[PDB]
Amino acid sequence: SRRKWNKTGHAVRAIGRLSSLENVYIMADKQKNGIKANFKIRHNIEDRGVQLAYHYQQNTPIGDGPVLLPDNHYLSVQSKLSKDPNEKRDHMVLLEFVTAAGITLVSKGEELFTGVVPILVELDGDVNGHKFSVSGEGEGDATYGKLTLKFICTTGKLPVPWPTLVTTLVQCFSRYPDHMKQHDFFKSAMPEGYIQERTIFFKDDGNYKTRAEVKFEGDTLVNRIELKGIDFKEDGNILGHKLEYNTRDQLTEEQIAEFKEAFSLFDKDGDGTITTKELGTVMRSLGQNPTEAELQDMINEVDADGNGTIDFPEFLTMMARKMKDTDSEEEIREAFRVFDKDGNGYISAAELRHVMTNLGEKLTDEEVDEMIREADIDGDGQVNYEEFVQMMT
Ligand SMILES: [Ca+2]
Ligand SMILES: [Ca+2]
Ligand SMILES: [Ca+2]
Ligand SMILES: [Ca+2]
């Protein structure tokens, strides 16, 4: 049928994911007696395209009491942005889940986070001289890494898109699994708290410099932030409000079933989890040729439970996130070059066969030709970049 495109499409999408770095990477910073962090955020642009935001982060304790300095690991975020239909003001309702991972198979401040903690957020900002203030409130549940908050823009209309402020607007609320509790800097510095500093680069546009104090005041965890933006284009995605607000949907029974079909290409023994050896097989037959260390690495990107293998659920989660976010054109080109083997700019009937045969799928010519026939918008008997993009959505 045509669901041969979706299958192998998603299989290339998956290797795309396992090759990139989408998490919050955290490292010791001994000099500053703290941590450093870096990560990339993808903001969907209205209709097509992505606006990427590269983050650099630094945290320093406010007090003198000993702190935990972690081995490298990451946080994994799931954000949901919504509207309060009763809210007249410019606002953002936020639901967020955050888990630590990245290390395969316990401080005094960790005690302060065992129940539900109230949160207050206070931001003053200035982007290209357009000043604004955001006020926020809600709760945090470190037990499940859960955050629920509502933010009001107290100065009227917010001059930047709400999504762009999510990372600035309390990582002490992340769930650290049992085996990684010695690595939780954030809770370790409570109640006195930390300074959190960031520079955020919006590609082809300006940057935010942020500084925040995160500490307890009485029984509330408070985040007080100042933000400065410069070099922004007034017609760009930020100042021009061209960024999608709504967290793209949930998942069809139809979509889940497609991700399962891809999953089975990797899970060749049908045991419900993907090994390094299984990942390798698919990649070699796809032309690439990675080391045992890379495979451990790619798997570690998505290995929620740290067992060294991608479990079926872990795989769904991974795919759900990869479908919610848009790939950059660089990334889509790489997906193309997997097919366009000679690199002429076009996927030939012959090239498409070569790939499928290798993926473990014998298919007749009318079969192959039909796939080609399906994607062929103009009708040159091949698939070019523009045709490919439209058939990878
Ligand atoms: Ca397996
Ligand atoms: Ca796993
Ligand atoms: Ca070609
Ligand atoms: Ca064509």
Domain chopping of the chain, boundaries: 1-22+250-393, 23-249
Category of 334 on φ-ψ map: left (φ > 0), alpha (ψ -120 to 50) or beta: alpha
Technique that determined the structure: X-ray
Q: Please, are residues 142 and 114 in contact by the beta-carbon 8 Å criterion?
A: yes
Phi, psi of 142 (to 5 degrees): -55, -30
Q: What's the N-to-C CA distance of the chain in angstroms?
A: 17
231 is in an annotated binding site: no
Long-range contact pairs involving 79-86 (C-beta distance under 8 Å, separation at least 24)? 79/166, 79/247, 80/247, 81/162, 81/163, 81/166, 81/245, 81/246, 81/247, 82/246, 82/247, 84/150
User: What spacing in Å lies between the alpha carbon of 352 and ligand 4's midpoint?
Assistant: 13
Q: What are the structure tokens assigned to 342, written together?
A: 């000679």
Q: Does 1-22+250-393 match 23-249 in CATH topology?
A: no
Which residue shows structure tokens 């419900």? 272
Which residue shows structure tokens 């990139």? 20
Question: What is residue 150's three-state secondary structure?
Answer: strand
Q: What are the structure tokens assigned to 337, written together?
A: 């070059």
Measured CA to CA, the distance from residue 183 to residue 306 in angstroms comes to 15
Q: What is the DSSP letter of 243?
A: B
Question: What is residue 190's three-state secondary structure?
Answer: coil
Q: Please, are residues 56 and 167 in contact by the beta-carbon 8 Å criterion?
A: no
- 117: closest CA among 190, 177, 68, 167? 190
User: What spacing in Å lies between the alpha carbon of 347 and ligand 4's midpoint?
Assistant: 9
Whether domain 1-22+250-393 has CATH 1.20.120.160 = no
Q: Is the peptide bond before 191 cis (omega within 30 degrees of 0)?
A: yes
Alpha-carbon 358 to chain mean position: 30
Q: Please, are residues 182 and 106 in contact by the beta-carbon 8 Å criterion?
A: yes
Give the sign of the dihedral formed by CA 111, CA 117, CA 122, CA 128.
positive
Q: Are strands 383-384 and 346-347 parallel, antiparallel or unpaired?
A: antiparallel
Nearest ligand to the CA of 380 is 4
Long-range contact pairs involving 368-377 (C-beta distance under 8 Å, separation at least 24)? 370/2, 371/2, 371/4, 371/5, 372/347, 374/2, 374/5, 375/5
Whether domain 23-249 has CATH 2.40.155.10 = yes
Find the Cα–Cα–Cα–Cα dihedral 279, 304, 297, 17, rounded to 10°. 60
Nearest ligand to the CA of 344 is 3
378 is in an annotated binding site: yes
Question: What is residue 220's three-state secondary structure?
Answer: strand
Measured CA to CA, the distance from residue 25 to residue 163 in angstroms comes to 20
273 is in an annotated binding site: yes
Residue 254 burial (CB count, 10 A): 8
User: What spacing in Å lies between the alpha carbon of 178 and ligand 1's midpoint?
Assistant: 26
Question: What is residue 342's three-state secondary structure?
Answer: coil
Give the sign of the dihedral formed by CA 192, CA 115, CA 162, CA 78.
positive
Which helix H or strand E contains 230, and what residues bound it? Answer: strand 220-230
Measured CA to CA, the distance from residue 116 to residue 315 in angstroms comes to 30
Residue 103 burial (CB count, 10 A): 19
> Buried (b) or exposed (e) across 60-95, using 16+ Cβ within 10 A?
bbeeeeebbbbeebbbbbebebeeeeeeeebbbbbe
Q: Please, are residues 134 and 158 in contact by the beta-carbon 8 Å criterion?
A: yes
Q: What are the structure tokens assigned to 205, written together?
A: 């546009």
Nearest ligand to the CA of 315 is 2
Measured CA to CA, the distance from residue 194 to residue 174 in angstroms comes to 15
Measured CA to CA, the distance from residue 259 to residue 318 in angstroms comes to 10
Alpha-carbon 91 to chain mean position: 23
Residues with CB under 5 A from ligand 1 (ion): 267, 269, 271
Category of 25 on φ-ψ map: left (φ > 0), alpha (ψ -120 to 50) or beta: beta
Question: What is residue 384's three-state secondary structure?
Answer: strand
Q: Please, are residues 264 and 11 in contact by the beta-carbon 8 Å criterion?
A: no
Stated in angstroms to one decimal place, the resolution of this structure is: 2.8
Measured CA to CA, the distance from residue 187 to residue 4 in angstroms comes to 48
167 is in an annotated binding site: no
Helix axis angle for 253-266 and 276-284, nearest 10°, is 90
Phi, psi of 309 (to 5 degrees): -135, 150
Measured CA to CA, the distance from residue 220 to residue 139 in angstroms comes to 9
Q: Are strands 220-230 and 117-127 parallel, antiparallel or unpaired?
A: parallel
User: What spacing in Å lies between the alpha carbon of 218 and ligand 4's midpoint?
Assistant: 65
Measured CA to CA, the distance from residue 290 to residue 312 in angstroms comes to 22
Which residue shows structure tokens 């769930």? 175
Which residue shows structure tokens 């399962």? 260
Q: Please, are residues 82 and 93 in contact by the beta-carbon 8 Å criterion?
A: yes
Question: What is residue 291's three-state secondary structure?
Answer: coil
What is the amino acid identity at position 359?
L
Category of 308 on φ-ψ map: left (φ > 0), alpha (ψ -120 to 50) or beta: left
- 145: closest CA among 187, 173, 167, 166? 173
User: What spacing in Å lies between the alpha carbon of 297 and ligand 1's midpoint?
Assistant: 17
